[PDB]
Swiss-Prot record:
Its main location: secreted. One of its GO terms (biological process) is neuropeptide signaling pathway. It comes from Eledone moschata (Musky octopus). PROSITE patterns: TACHYKININ. This is Eledoisin. InterPro entries: Tachy_Neuro_lke_CS. Belongs to the tachykinin family. Tachykinins are active peptides which excite neurons, evoke behavioral responses, are potent vasodilators and secretagogues, and contract (directly or indirectly) many smooth muscles. The keyword Cell wall biogenesis/degradation does not apply. It is found in: Secreted. Transmembrane segments: none annotated. The modification Methionine amide is found at M11.
Length: 11
């Protein structure tokens, strides 16, 4: 999902 991409920002 797109919300999962938000986790890519932190990483």
């Amino acid at each position: 999902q797109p919300s999962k991409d938000a986790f890519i920002g932190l990483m």
